């Protein structure tokens, strides 16, 4: 969903 | 707490303030995705609207950007991010073009002639297609010249029946398994049944399950309406030359007509000598590779077309199909096919090979020459280096494979 | 760190772990405390304790020197990476299947040998073991029963391990003869149509360590399955041995077809090799053992409790891809297309049930069906898939109201 992909991405690229 | 939209951004732009269209497209394109694809329709619309507002027609600052995107923006991030069931697609379809030309090399076969449609292809037209569940293509060789389903119709056709009537009522009129013997050879099982749908006399008993009580101009209709339901809009043709020509050698079909009325293997009010119509016409229905290759991909989606999200089949239809086509696909190579490649497939007198591997992708693979089981010697050659490389028999191991390459895991 | 990492998951420190806590908090997972890849920790654990004062808690410095040899495994096990990371709700979905074949009571027990005649109807086990050492098990899973054909698989599996692909079938072939699985016949090219039809079965067991004596013969076969069943129980009744050869006419009259045939590799010994064949059917396994043993065979040749490599991909490949295809006698073809896993039968009532790249099963119940198919074992199996996504054509993306195990 948006949820998951939001939270592993902001993490890795942020 | 920044949006998905700000991330792509960010990811794109390299830490510039404005992302030229050009650079986006051209990423977008790497990830396999194309820019027609129907699920993007709505971001490729708002970047043209969008574009023409701009005073260079090429830069989009960060809200601009956010505004194309939104409404596509999962489905993009997944592409982006490699979250594609074949994350590393470039690499893939490296691969997929070292296989065509190795089975380019391959001249061996005789382009089928009992019809003279089919005797004027020339023998080195060879294209493949992969679509995968996720909507990632690529083409190589001859893969937009359109030919005819002939038998790759049958598994779609019986998806149909089993979708709109299905397994019990289907059954009750075709068995499930392989002859065991040369399809080449006219019974039926211990019930009086054709073993399978595959073989000819099963394939044309299902033909006769299809929108009965109606008329053949509207069951045709009603299959190519599905047919490009699976290909997802892409193309679905039809030739009537071929479709004269099949009826006018039909003595051998009709006997299997005749035979399967006297057995009464036909649903009660069937007009054999118009199922035996409408089997001619379904085998004349045309297809691309590139279109042919959607329809096996939504068979390896579950019935979903990828490039749509549509759902098209039920998920009995397509497990069945799958099954019948791991099993008697492939003519008299059957059995030898699943026990190497592991992967249903579909043949036909055309030269097309419609293969699936589940979860993964669809692929249509095309060559007019035939080897002597009717199989295309190119399709055939590539499908087994396919599995040698790949670990896609269905039986291979998805933690313990040896030399072999699992394209859904990265590098 | 990663030791620091577990120590404190179970801790809630506390500045001290009770070692039962860590212990059914790792039965949990579905490992168990005998699993051979745990032993070091284990052994560890024993001997650290007895220097302790109570001999039950253990510090960060001394849970850590326990756990450390076995780390990767333990957090793997507790940080939910296991193929089915949900077990405990996985085996209460086992359970229920279970109780539901249990009130199929139809059937008849084999009595052609005194030897199966003998077993109640009532016997019914199903035992489990995932590709990550999961075990469960519910019912009378610690019996032991002979393989008979369930053994077809393992001895061609061997044969392809040590031979190759291509040697093995030189003198087998590779697909159903879609007839009846009684026979005989061969293929077009004078061959068994493969090799889980009786004579294919005969065929195979004539060309594993040929040159030696059958007592050699068996020790090798026996070695082989204690280690696809991770050395848990493999023993052998001598009783059905005997009683299999006198009433083994049958068998004998394949064995004088296939001789003048030229089915069998050169200087064979018909007599001997049936004495083989019958030695193998007589080989006695419980559904645990045998649990193991398919896990194998789900996992690409390597035994999942021990990590050892014990078949080559090609071996369990080919395998798996006649089982999926002729294991299940006449029943085999409708098997495939309803059920769409590879699985074999035995006439005492097993069925060996691989879903690869998850699990391998073993179901016992002694009352057969009409094909030679155990009554419950066949229901099980259709509710397993019925129930669950694991249909080899099932998808793992879209599947309408089936569970998927392999997510949380
Ligand atoms: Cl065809
Ligand atoms: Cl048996």
Redesign the pocket.
């Known amino acids: 969903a948006k949820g998951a992909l939001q939270e592993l991405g902001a993490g890795l690229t942020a | 707490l920044p949006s998905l939209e700000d991330l792509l951004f960010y990811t794109i732009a390299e830490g510039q303030e404005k992302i030229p269209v050009h650079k986006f497209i051209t990423a977008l394109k790497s990830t396999g995705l194309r820019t027609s694809d129907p699920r993007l329709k709505e971001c490729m619309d708002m970047l043209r609207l969008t574009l023409q507002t701009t005073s260079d027609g090429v830069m989009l600052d960060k809200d601009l950007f956010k505004k194309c995107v939104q409404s596509n923006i999962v489905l993009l991030t997944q592409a982006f991010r490699r979250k594609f069931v074949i994350p590393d697609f470039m690499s893939f379809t490296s691969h997929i073009d070292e296989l065509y030309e190795s089975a380019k090399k391959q001249s061996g076969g005789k382009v089928a002639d009992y019809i003279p449609q089919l005797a004027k292809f020339s023998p080195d037209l060879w294209g493949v297609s992969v679509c995968t569940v996720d909507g990632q293509r690529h083409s190589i060789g001859d893969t937009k010249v359109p030919f005819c389903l ?3 119709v049958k598994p779609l056709k019986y998806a149909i029946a089993v979708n709109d009537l299905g397994t019990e009522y289907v059954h009750r009129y075709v068995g499930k398994e392989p002859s065991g013997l040369r399809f080449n050879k006219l019974f039926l099982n211990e019930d009086d049944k054709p073993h399978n749908p595959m073989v000819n006399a099963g394939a044309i008993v299902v033909t006769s399950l299809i929108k009965q009580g109606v008329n053949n101009a509207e069951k045709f209709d009603y299959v190519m309406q599905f047919l490009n339901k699976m290909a997802g809009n892409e193309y679905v043709g039809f030739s009537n030359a071929t479709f004269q020509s099949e009826r006018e050698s039909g003595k051998r079909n009709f006997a299997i007509g005749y035979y399967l009325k006297e057995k009464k293997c036909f649903p009660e009010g069937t007009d054999m000598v118009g199922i035996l119509d409408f089997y001619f016409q379904l ?1 004349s229905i045309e297809v691309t590779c590139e279109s042919a290759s959607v329809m096996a991909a939504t068979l390896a989606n579950g019935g979903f077309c990828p490039i749509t999200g549509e759902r098209v089949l039920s998920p009995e239809a397509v497990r069945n199909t799958l099954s019948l086509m791991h099993s008697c696909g492939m003519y008299d190579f059957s059995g030898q096919f699943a026990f190497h490649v592991g992967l249903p497939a579909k ?4 030269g097309g090979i419609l293969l699936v591997v589940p979860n993964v992708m669809g692929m249509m693979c095309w060559s007019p020459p035939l080897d002597k089981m ?1 199989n295309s010697v190119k399709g055939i050659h590539f499908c087994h280096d396919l599995v040698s490389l790949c670990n896609f028999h269905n039986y291979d191991n998805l933690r313990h494979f040896a030399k072999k390459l699992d394209p859904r895991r990265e590098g």
């Open positions: 002939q038998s790759c085998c043949s036909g007198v055309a009717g």
